Design a protein around this ligand. Structure first.
Ligand SMILES: Nc1ncnc2c1ncn2[C@@H]1O[C@H](COP(=O)(O)OP(=O)(O)NP(=O)(O)O)[C@@H](O)[C@H]1O
Lengths: 75, 367, 347
């Protein structure tokens, strides 16, 4: 299945995923496609920050669901 | 001279600080008459006498799982401790009491309340048993493995403070080991079912049982030579012989399946305990596993704990099992040691401090 | 007794600036009792202590101790004055202050609970529904209880690393943050608020066991906050989220400028925010207040006629007393442990 991750600029990265895939997994897939290190990634769906251990099912993320992506700014 | 009482799940160990053994060690059980009229011409029985009159009495273990549960019977145990065993008036001696790990807040307040308002002690303190056991071995940091009569605890302690978030409790200890020994000697042919026969089987356990280094070769050696068998003489003169039973019984501590328990084993709970602690302190813990209490008293137990934790821990971890020879009563001995230190004279809860703030004071002084 | 206890207590190796202040005052509240005459020295030390003004207050304590020397022990003032010039603070290890601030977070929260009618948070719903990013849910329930506003106020973290970036970037204090990036995972704890998972704690002050974040200091940051303000305990450094609170408040102030009680109501937010950030272990007091007091954020309030009290309270006596007991317990245990281990050497 397919989902869409939207960034602050409103560009959209599309990703093929299995509902079994964890968040650690989706963040790694984003790193592979775009370079973003996952410890900087913050995935948001239904207004909640998504936690790494849980899976897409556990958040009721069906096909064509949209995630939102916010990158941490630190030093 | 200050008193030291270890409030134990099956044995109360009391004595005087400065001595290096408790003077009184008696079953921590209260007996009341089963039918009226065994009362005509005399009320209740405590300790060694209440086991002697088990058949005319209804026994109650007021502290069965390490946490005192019946305060009317605890009042009577402590009264028997002060007045029959030690033969002293409590108004005349500061008194150090032990408590189990994770002891509720209120259980602590009620302990203080009784000691000041029922025994009118000048001073008192409450230390955790495991901490005292660590202190008697000169450490203030390690993980203590406390295995007594009704309860075992794995208790990490960092600079004197037992860590509530990582303390593991486990309802398998000597009472359960003594019953298993009963069961398996029965399956062999020797009938032990009566409460009087339970008492001999406890003697057989503390005199002949030991921990196998590996269970399997010991079974193999039992199955292939007489070398492990030991004769035991009963009270009526009959002699019986204990074979693999000697080590099958304490084996229950590492394999609770032997009794139907789907728990872990004193080695797994130890590791589990260590792993609820911050990574930064595990090295200290792993190098100071302190064995403590009557049920750690089996020959061979230190060496198997060494082996099993080495199998659970990372491959470079330096591991030490510390099993003192005095560890049957090292709780009490650490109590005796503590009460004696002069600096400890600044840490008693005083009669003055108590009616200034009441029983809740225990929380601000004893931690 | 008390002369010999504070003697032992002062022998401790790990005694910090905040330990000394509390230990000192406990001695003078017992030695000179409640003679009114010194009532205001006690009141002033507690107020300087809260403001983390240890230098002035240690100064005031020795000097008070000289000008009352005949009233005290010369043995005890010698140890006090001899130990003072060597006293430091350690942001990794400020245990007496962690417990104080955590008890204080409760006192503050309860003061707000009988002060506020909760209208400010119902009015504030709209400023959040306006400045939130699109991925943040709107708030449409009415805020009836203080926890319901506690959870609302906290949800401003949804704005982080996006909406508040314009004014984050005007700070010269915030680049000197020194939270280490290395993700360390979660450790279980039974202490509340800002306390350390492993520190001793009163057994009526425990909280149910749950996981909390380990965070490290970088220590290689030049001018880092931990280095310049070692009095404040490190929980997570400077709070970036409070720029997120400033984006919401700016909007609120703009559209309630004519409000006559505006100053009253902004202090209920700033203060409820402060209490919750300590109580929940996100940040200690100064890690929040020292981003709020930077002069470019202070304009925002000054130009609108708002004076922030910063949760400074009438008195801190209960929480200050409780902390004395704590450091009293810990430092005598230190003494007892030293007698213990020097008795095993000799065996
Ligand atoms: N080889 C042995 N030698 C001596 N005692 C033994 C031995 N094996 C078991 N014990 C048992 O060890 C238990 C002694 O319990 P004890 O350590 O006093 O526990 P407690 O009453 O729970 N007090 P505590 O350990 O301080 O919590 C009894 O069940 C004894 O039968």
């Amino acid at each position: 299945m397919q989902i869409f991750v939207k960034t602050l600029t409103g560009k959209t990265i599309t990703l093929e995923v299995e509902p079994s895939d964890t968040i650690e997994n989706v963040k790694a897939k984003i790193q592979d496609k775009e370079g973003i290190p996952p410890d900087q990634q913050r995935l948001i769906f239904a207004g909640k920050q998504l936690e790494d251990g849980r899976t897409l099912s556990d958040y009721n993320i069906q096909k064509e669901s949209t995630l939102h992506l916010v990158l941490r700014l630190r030093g | 001279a200050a008193l030291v009482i270890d409030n134990g799940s099956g044995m109360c160990k009391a004595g005087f600080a400065g001595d290096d053994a408790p003077r009184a060690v008696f079953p921590s059980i209260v007996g009341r008459p089963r039918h009226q009229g065994v009362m005509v011409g005399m009320d209740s029985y405590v300790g060694d006498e209440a086991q002697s009159k088990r058949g005319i009495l209804t026994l109650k273990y007021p502290i069965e799982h390490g946490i005192v549960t019946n305060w009317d019977d605890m009042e009577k145990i402590w009264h028997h401790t002060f007045y029959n065993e030690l033969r002293v008036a409590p108004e005349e001696h500061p008194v150090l009491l032990t408590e189990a790990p994770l002891n509720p807040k209120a259980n602590r307040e009620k302990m203080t309340q009784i000691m000041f308002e029922t025994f009118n002690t000048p001073a008192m303190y409450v230390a955790i048993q495991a901490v005292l056991s660590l202190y008697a071995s000169g450490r203030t940091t390690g993980i203590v493995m406390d295995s007594g009569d009704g309860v075992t605890h794995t208790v990490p302690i960092y600079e004197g403070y037992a860590l509530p978030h990582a303390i593991l409790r486990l309802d398998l200890a000597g009472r359960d080991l003594t019953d298993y020994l009963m069961k398996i000697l029965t399956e062999r042919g020797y009938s032990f079912t009566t409460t009087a026969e339970r008492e001999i089987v406890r003697d057989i356990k503390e005199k002949l049982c030991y921990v196998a280094l590996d269970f399997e070769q010991e079974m193999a050696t039992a199955a292939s030579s007489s070398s492990l068998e030991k004769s035991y003489e009963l009270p009526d003169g009959q002699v019986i012989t204990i074979g693999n039973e000697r080590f099958r019984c304490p084996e229950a501590l590492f394999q609770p399946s032997f009794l139907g328990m789907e728990s872990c084993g004193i080695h797994e709970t130890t590791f589990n305990s260590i792993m609820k602690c911050d990574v930064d302190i595990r090295k200290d813990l792993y190098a100071n596993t302190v064995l403590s209490g009557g049920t750690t008293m089996y020959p061979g137990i230190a060496d198997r704990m060494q082996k099993e934790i080495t199998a659970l821990a990372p491959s470079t971890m330096k591991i030490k099992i510390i099993a003192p020879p005095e560890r049957k009563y090292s709780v009490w001995i650490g109590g005796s040691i503590l009460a004696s230190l002069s600096t400890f004279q600044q840490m008693w809860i005083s009669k003055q401090e108590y009616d200034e703030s009441g029983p809740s004071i225990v929380h601000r002084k004893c931690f | 007794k008390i002369e010999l206890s504070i003697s032992l207590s002062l022998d401790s190796p790990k005694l910090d600036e905040s330990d000394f202040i509390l230990l000192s005052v406990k001695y003078l509240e017992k030695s000179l009792g409640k003679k009114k005459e010194f009532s205001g020295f006690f009141e002033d030390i507690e107020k300087l202590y809260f403001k983390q003004n240890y230098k002035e207050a240690i100064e005031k304590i020795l000097d008070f101790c000289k000008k009352n020397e005949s009233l005290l022990s010369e043995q005890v003032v010698q140890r006090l004055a001899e130990v003072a010039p060597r006293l430091k603070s350690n942001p990794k290890d400020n245990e007496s202050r962690r417990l104080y601030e955590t008890l204080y977070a409760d006192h503050l929260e309860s003061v707000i609970k009988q002060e506020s009618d909760l209208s400010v948070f119902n009015e504030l719903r709209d400023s959040y529904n306006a400045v939130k990013p699109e991925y943040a849910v709107t708030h449409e329930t009415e805020i009836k209880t203080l926890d319901e506003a506690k959870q609302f106020i906290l949800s401003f973290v949804m704005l982080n690393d996006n909406v508040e970036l314009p004014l984050k970037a005007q700070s010269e204090r915030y680049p000197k943050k020194d939270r280490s990036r290395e993700e360390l995972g979660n450790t279980p704890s039974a202490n509340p608020g800002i306390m350390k998972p492993n520190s001793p704690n009163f057994t009526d002050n425990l909280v149910p066991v749950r996981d909390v974040p380990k965070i490290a200091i970088n220590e290689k940051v030049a001018g880092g906050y931990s280095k310049t303000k070692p009095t404040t305990p490190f929980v997570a450094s400077l709070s970036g989220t409070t720029y997120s609170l400033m984006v919401v408040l700016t909007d609120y102030i703009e559209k309630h400028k004519t409000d006559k009680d505006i100053e009253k109501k902004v202090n209920q937010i700033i203060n409820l925010w402060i209490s919750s950030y300590i109580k929940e272990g996100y940040h200690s007091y100064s890690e929040v207040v020292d981003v709020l007091t930077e002069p470019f954020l202070q304009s925002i309030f000054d130009k609108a006629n708002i004076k922030l009290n910063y949760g400074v309270l009438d008195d801190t006596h209960a929480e200050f007393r409780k902390a004395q007991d704590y450091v009293f317990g810990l430092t005598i245990q230190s003494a007892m442990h030293h007698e213990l281990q020097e008795r095993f050497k000799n065996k």
